[model samples]
Each structure stands twice: as structure tokens, then as C-alpha cells.
Target: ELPPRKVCIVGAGVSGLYIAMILDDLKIPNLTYDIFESSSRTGGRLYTHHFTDAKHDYYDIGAMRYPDIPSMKRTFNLFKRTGMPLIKYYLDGENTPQLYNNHFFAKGVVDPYMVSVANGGTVPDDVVDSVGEKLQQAFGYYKEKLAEDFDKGFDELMLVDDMTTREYLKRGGPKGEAPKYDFFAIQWMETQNTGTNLFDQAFSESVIASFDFDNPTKPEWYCIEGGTSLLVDAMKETLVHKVQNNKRVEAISIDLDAPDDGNMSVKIGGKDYSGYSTVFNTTALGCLDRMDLRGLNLHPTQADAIRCLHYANSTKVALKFSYPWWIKDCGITCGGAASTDLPLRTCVYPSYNLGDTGEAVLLASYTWSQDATRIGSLVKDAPPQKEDELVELILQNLARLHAEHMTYEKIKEAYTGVYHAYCWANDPNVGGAFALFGPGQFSNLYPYLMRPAAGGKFHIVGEASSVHHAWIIGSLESAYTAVYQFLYKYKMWDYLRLLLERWQ
Candidate 1:
């Protein structure tokens, strides 16, 4: 009898853990796997930090919110099985109630949850409205096309992949000189809503993101109760034996001569582990590229895709305050975000503990792309003392942004405990927070990155490989795709077909 097939999965992030969970559920006969995480814990980007002494007051520094949309079937299915409770999360919008008592500070003007702050309040209200209407017209044109037929519409939009979002908005604006309001409006939409780097992202990527803004019927957003890490913990329970923590993968080698047998090996630390039939890499492409893959005989396209893909940098700073001043003083009764032109970018108020008098944790700053890079650099290589300096800088910025509601003395008085800051770019295991396609990268590189290599012996799975970038749902989708490919390679046609049917 042939020996049972064994698979190796590198990185115990959401993708790796999800793959293991699905395979365990399938219970494929004589199939087993091992998961190796460079870090001591699972859930790479699904990080939640609890207070030193206060467990109830915690903050999710990464991937805090999830959209409850029909397209995210895999995510919902997992939630059903895990029995993790979800609480409604407020996505900042004009009519979404004051759940997130939003304050916007930009161009010397502070407006509450309004994008017009970017224009410095110099533009007339009517002119701002007109500019917003024109910008919406441009966004709607593309959003409608993509919603009608995603692939076809994407192909049509791909023709201009080389153009940046700023350039596209300018070109698509009303005839004659593009108004300054048009620029600020698009900037506001991109930075505050889309979580994209406005100037760097391709016009096509920007248009796709616009669907989130244009679709009023989009499902409500929610965050997992307790913390998002609870899902990871639940998934890891069944995979305790299969998982190996602190096993840093240094290289991967595939036996091209034994392609039919799916023979592969992984090098961890200074030792090589063999006997794996297949390997699934869930690490970020940037980190993956840093590994020794010369033995895999990668196609030029695959190598180029890995080389060219862009990953987004992000930073989060969480502060524990003695009081929930946002609710008592700012009237932000529910969870809402406040935006600012400062490097802090956005501040997220907690929804967990409301009305209570106990201490609360607030996301003092959450920044992405360029803003992240700026603040990330401040603390990335800084000494321990420099972190204190950085926190002071952030507190100063917060005081200026929330001048009406808070001051330096007020923040210092209410600040009771630890101030934690994380820069994803500085994380050794993760080079960046998430993957993003640069101009022309989607059309030219993303497809190649998604393809399996080494004659099906190597598979890549992660949020970077999915359409819904930076979301946990994206990671789950990629995991599903990897499993489908694995089953197909093993000639489990019936099983693969069943999985496809369920997804359809």
C-alpha cells in the first residue's frame, strides 16, 4: 500500500490555519499535513493585544472589521462553524449614525465626519457639493460597469492600468481646468474611505475600490466579539498537534524529476525536512522572495510577479485611557473613526465598552500607505527611549486634532496605562500589512503570482492572492483556491467539484 500523503504548510497565519481546518473537515483518506509558523503564535495579521492587567479592554491592531457581504461566503461559513459572535461595527458614512463620532481635521479646518475639510473650508459649500457630484459621476461610471460584470468590466478598465488615481480623476472630471475641489474630493474618498494610497494606486484599482463607496446596499460591517484572534484560537484548537511554532522556513526545494509524486522539501533554521508531497506557502510574497527558491525552477513570469507585487505598509497605535472621553465629551456614543491630515491619519474609538465608567482602549492612530511609512519610520529603528518620544509626538498631534475635546494635559491625565504601537513594515515575518497591485501589476503580474509552481508541488495562498485585498475574507478565499488546487492535483475530482458547487 502507498504511504499516506503528507503536505507542508509554511506560516500559520489565517490562510494556513484555514487550509488546515478545511482539510481536516474534508477528512481525505490517508492525507495529513504539518503547519510551521516562524513566529510563536498563529494569526499573522489578525493580531489583538490585551491590556497588561485589564483583559476585557483590548484592541485589534490588524484587520479589525469585516464586511458581512454575500460574496464572502467562506468567511460566513467559517464563522458559523466557529460560533464566534459578531458585533456591529460602524463604517463611517453620512447617514450611518454617530456610532463613530467622527472628527475630520485637514487644511486648517476641523469638520465632523465631512470630507470638505480637505478643501480648508475656503471653497463654497455649493461648489464643494458640485465637485463631489462630479467626482461621484466619475466613480459611478466605473462602479456600475464593474458591478454589472466584474471580469469584463475589469478588462475594460485594465486598458488604462498605467494611469494613477489622481491622473484618472483629473481626466474624468468635467471639461476645462480640473477644479481643486475635484482633487481634494477624490483624495478624501481614497484616503479616508478606500484605505488606499491615493497617489500610488492604479486608476483601475481605485475604481474597483469605489464600488465600496457607491454601493449603498453593501452589507453592514462587524467585528468579532472578544477579539478577532478568538477565531484563530478556535481554529487552532483542532490543529494543535499539526502545528509547529517557531519553525522559521528558510528555503523550499522541489524534485522536478518526481513531479508526478509531488515530492518537495522545506528548509527551516539550519535543518532540512523532507518527505512532504506538496508545500503551501502562506507567507507574504515579499518575505517569500527572500527565501531560497532557486531549486523550484520558477518560470520567468512567476519570478517577475513575485518581484513586482506591491505590499501596503500600515501602523496602529493603541492607548489605554482612564475614561471614555469620546463618549462623555465628544458625543460619539458609538464606535466611529476620526480623520486628520496629521500622520496619525485616523483614530478609531472603541465600541466594546460604552456607558461604563471603567478604563477603555482607543486606537489612537491607524494609518496606511504613505502615512504609515512616515510614522512607521519614526519608530521602526528607534531605541526604547525613542518609542516614548514617538508616543509623545503622536499625543501632540492628537491634541491638535482634538483641540476642542482634548488637550495635552487632558490626554496625559486620562492616559492610565501602556501605549502600544505596531508597524507592520517592521514586522520580520510580514514585510507589509497587505498586498496591493501597483499600476499595471494586476493585469501583468497578479495572474502569474496566483499560478502554482514546480509542477503542482508548490502552491501560494494568502490574502495577497485574492481580489479582496487586506481583508480576512480574501485570505479565506485564497485558502479555498489552494485547497481546490491540491485536490485537483491528487485527482480528487469529485471532491473538487463538490467544493466548486458550494462556492457557486
Candidate 2:
């Protein structure tokens, strides 16, 4: 016998789970594999923390929404195949009222905060009109191009890979040199458009906005009904007896000089396990950098790419309140997000459980990049102290942004009593929320990271290795690429390649 063609997949995240699912769906014979996860649970960033209440309402501390676009066909296909129900997710008061900088705005109000800030608080009528016209023109230009050519447009955009979003926008918008506040307004607008800051990011990365520009009124954002983790759970059930939780892979050893049919070894916990024909490392490259890689003999370029790939530090604070006060008291009927220049950055309201007289969870604070670093420092203590300090700090900021009456005592009183903070930067399993491409990284390091290592024995697959970067679909696409590469390397090409072509 040929020893049953076994493989070892490290990290039981969405990427690894999807790879296993694909293999089983294809009915690959004589294939056996083990999924080793450092954490005690699966889903990786698809984490949903539930509140102990009547409805058992939960909040996703990680990836919460999925885009309903053509680029996200794979994600939708998975949802359809698994029978997952998709619910509409409101983005920034599209169908609901929102509070921005303590100012209430109804749906379809159209960038009231941005306009106010750009004109610097009640400017001349002519100046305000000009500012609005310039902003709209700039936004329309980028939006049209992105909508038309995002998937097939990278080749042309790659020429400007070395340029920052600030540079690109400054040169392209208006005539000669718009005011400093105009740039600030654009940055704020871009941040609201994409979850990440745009100023320092590569121009190419900013092309894909969080919500659809073509049809902003359409239901572009969605979430799973019960929880985002339901997709992971469905995948996990299919991969029963194939996954090992808390099996932290400390080191991976590939025998480059071994016979053609020999197996590699993986160090888990304190023991070495041999007999995996190949190893698929689906963990974040940053996490993988912390592991013992001396045995693999990685190229210097590969090592540098692994070390230097940019990962965005993100912090999310979820607060469980006694009732839906933003709806009941504040008269904000629908789900949306409130923006602020405060360290809090953004406050997201839950789209679920509308009008229900029950405890509600609000994503009180969502900060990214430098904003996250500022908040992460405050909570860099023991869990109890960290939670207490963060809750107080966030409450203060929320009071300033939402309403003056929403004082700490007033907010705390509405606490059906649970609050938690998560900083992805401090997380050991995942060093950061997701990979972010800096200037020149998309052209240089991205392709290198996506390629396999140690001949065909070691494969790297994750959202970090994808062009899409932060989305779950990116993770799935990377998984597909890794699977296709592995199958091709093993000479199982014809059928697997054909199937992959269907995805393309």
C-alpha cells in the first residue's frame, strides 16, 4: 500500500476548513489529514461572543458582515450550499437614522458630518457649495472606476502601487492643491468607505470600498442570521474526526533529502509527529513567523516577506446593554454606524433584534491602525482591569459622540451587564486583524507570500496570501489556490484544475 496519502493542515481557521471541505467534496480517495489548531475553538476570526440573556443574542468580535457583490460569488455559493440564511446589514444609516458627532441625521442625509467638517463649521454659502461639488466629483470618479473594473483592473492600477492614497487623491481631485481640511475630509470619507485608513495605504488597496458605490441603496451588506460562526460550524461538522483543537504546531520539519515517497514531521505541543506527506500552513504569516522555521531552510526573500508583510492592528469593544436605548430613547430606528474623530473611531449598531424589548449588544468601539494602538495601550493590563478601564473609557467617548445625557452612570445603568474588549494586535494566535498592503507591497511581497515553500512539501494559504486581503472570501480563494497547487504538484491535475477553472 502507498501509506494512504496523508497531509497535515495547521490552523483550523476558515481557510483550513474550506480546504478540507473542498477535498471531501471532490471525493479525493485514500486522503487523510489532521487539522491542528492552537486555540481550543475553530472559526479563527469568525468569532461570535454570545450574551447570557433571553434571546442569547451574540456579537461578532471579528468579521461581522459580508459584501453581496460579484467578487464575493464564492462566499455566496458556500452560503447557498450550506443553507445559511443571509440577513441585511445596514451600513452607516442607509435605511436608518444615525448619530454622528452628537448630531442626529436621518437616512439619505448624505455626508452631513463630512460636509460640516470640510467647510469648518458654518462657512460661507459659496464655499460650502464649492466644497460639496469638489468632494462629490472626486468620490464619483473613484466610485465609477471601482465599480466597473475592480476585479480586472489591478494591472492598470499596479503602475501606481508605489503611490499612497493621499498622493493619488490630491493629484486627481479638483484643480491645484485643495485645502488641508479637504484632504482630511477625504481621509475621513475613505475610512468610512473602507474599514481601514486610506492615507498611508497603497492606492490600489483603497479601490475596493466596504460598501458598493454603484448601488448604495441596494442591500450590499449582509450577515448570517444566528451567527457568523454557523458557517464554520457547518464546515466543522463535515470535517469530524479530522481536526485537533489545542494542538499548537510549534515547528515543521521538511526532509528535502528524503526519498520521493517519505513523509515530513510536525512538532505539536511537546511531541514530534511524523508521517504527513505534505503540510498546509493556513495560519497567518505573522503567527507562522513566531514558529520554528529553521528546519525548512526558507529563502532570504521569503523570510523577509514573512517578517515585513503589513498587518493592521484592530480593537473592538462590545457592550451589552439592558435595553435598545439607541432605538427606544434616541429614536434611531434602524441599524447603522456612528463616526467620530475620538479615539473610538467608529461605533456600530446591531442590525439584529430590531424593536425587540430585550437586552442589546452594541459594538461600542472599533478602531484600526494608529487609532487601535492608542486604545490598545489603555487595556494593556490584566483582564479584569483591562475590561473595567476599557468600558469606562469607551463609555466616556460614546457619551461625547452619541449624547451628553449618555453619561457613564446612565450608560452603565443600561448594562444588562456584560462588556468585553478584544485587541487583535495582542492576540498570540493572530498577530493582527488582517494583512494590509503598504506602498509597493502588492507588487513585491504579495506574490512571494502566496507561493509555496520547501519544494512541494510546505504550502502557505490564508487571507494574508490573497489579493482581497481582509475578507473571508479572500481566505477561501487562497485556500482554493493552495489546494490547486498541491493537487498539481502531486500530479492530480486534470480534474482539480478543471474544477478550479469553474471558480475563475
**Runs of candidate 1 exceeding 4 Å displacement:** 1-3, 53-55, 93-132, 145-156, 173-197, 259-262, 380-387, 501-504
Please give me the total number of clashing residue pairs in predicted model 1: 4
Identify the leading candidate in terms of TM-score: 1
Query: Listing every candidate in turn, what is its Cα RMSD in Å to the true structure after a full C-alpha superposition?
Result: 4.3, 3.9
* C-alpha root-mean-square deviation, candidate 1: 4.3
Model 2, which residues run further than 4 Å from truth? 1-3, 94-151, 171-198, 210-219, 380-382, 385-387, 404-409, 501-504
> Model 2, 337-367: lDDT tens per residue?
7776667878888887676777788888888
lDDT of 1 by residue, 1-504 (tens): 334888999999989998898778776678788899999978899898877535458889787776665556578788888998888877662211111124533343344345344545433344443534655655666667666765677777777787776776656533424444455555554544545465557766667666653453576887787788888888988873567899999899987666446478899987989888889999998888989998888888888888778888889888878887767766767777777666677788776666566788878888888888888776644447424776787778767666776678887788874678889999999989887778778878888887768777688889888777777878998888888888887788776787677543
Checking candidate 1 for backbone clashes, the offending pairs are 99-334, 99-335, 100-335, 100-336
Provide the TM-score for each candidate, comma-separated: 0.87, 0.86
Q: After best superposition, candidate 1 residue 221: deviation in angstroms?
A: 1.2
